[PDB]
Amino acid sequence: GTLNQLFHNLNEIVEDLNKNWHRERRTLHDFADELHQLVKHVHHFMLQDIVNQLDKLFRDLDNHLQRKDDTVHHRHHQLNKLLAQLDNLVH
Amino acid sequence: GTLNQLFHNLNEIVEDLNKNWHRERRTLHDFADELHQLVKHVHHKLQDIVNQLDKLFRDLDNHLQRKDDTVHHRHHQLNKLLAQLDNLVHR
Ligand SMILES: [Cl-]
Ligand SMILES: [Pt+2]
Q: What DSSP line would sit under A12-61, residue for residue?
A: HHHHHHHHHHHHHHHHHHHHHHHHHHHHHHHHHH---HHHHHHHHHHHHH
Please give the backbone phi and psi of residue B90, each rounded to the nearest 5 degrees, phi first.
Answer: -105, 30
Are the beta carbons of A4 and A90 closer than 8 angstroms? Answer: yes
What total number of domains does chain A contain?
A: 1
Torsion of CA B28, B32, B33, B35, to 10 degrees: 140
Residues B68 and B21: their CA atoms lie apart, in Å, by: 9
CB A89 within 8 A of CB B6: yes
User: Which of A56, A67, A60 is CA-nearest to residue B29?
Assistant: A60
CB count within 10 Å of CB A43 equals: 12
Whole-number Å distance between alpha carbons of B35 and B56? 8
Domain boundaries, position A17: 2-90
Nearest-Å Rg of the Cα atoms of chain A is 20
Sign (positive/negative) of CA torsion B28, A17, A62, B58?
negative
* Alpha-carbon A79 to chain mean position: 15
- Please tell me the distance in Å from A6's CA to the nearest CA on chain B: 7
Method: X-ray
* CB proximity B3 to A under 8 Å: yes
Resolution of the coordinates, Å: 2.2
Mutate to test the interface with B, among A11, A53, A58, A76 (most CBs of B within 10 A): A53
A45 contacts in chain B (CB < 8 Å): 45-46, 49
Q: Does A87 touch chain B (CB under 8 A)?
A: no
Q: Return the number of other C-beta atoms located less than 10 Å from residue A63's C-beta.
A: 11
> Cβ-count burial of A15 within 10 angstroms (0-12 exposed, 13-18 middle, 19+ buried)?
exposed
Find, among A76, A25, A43, the residue nearest to B67 by Cα: A25
Contact B24 A64 (CB under 8 A): yes
